[PDB]
């Protein structure tokens, strides 16, 4: 979701990707 990682729709991952990108494989942005 443009700056923070979900699971589908839901922040759960705990990192951000305000750049456009997420570090966590099995969470989306």
């Keep these: 979701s443009w700056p ?5 729709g839901l922040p759960v991952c705990g990192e951000t990707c305000v750049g456009g990108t997420c ?6 942005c």
């Design 4 to 8: 923070v990682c979900t699971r589908n």
């Design 23 to 28: 570090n966590t494989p099995g969470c989306t």
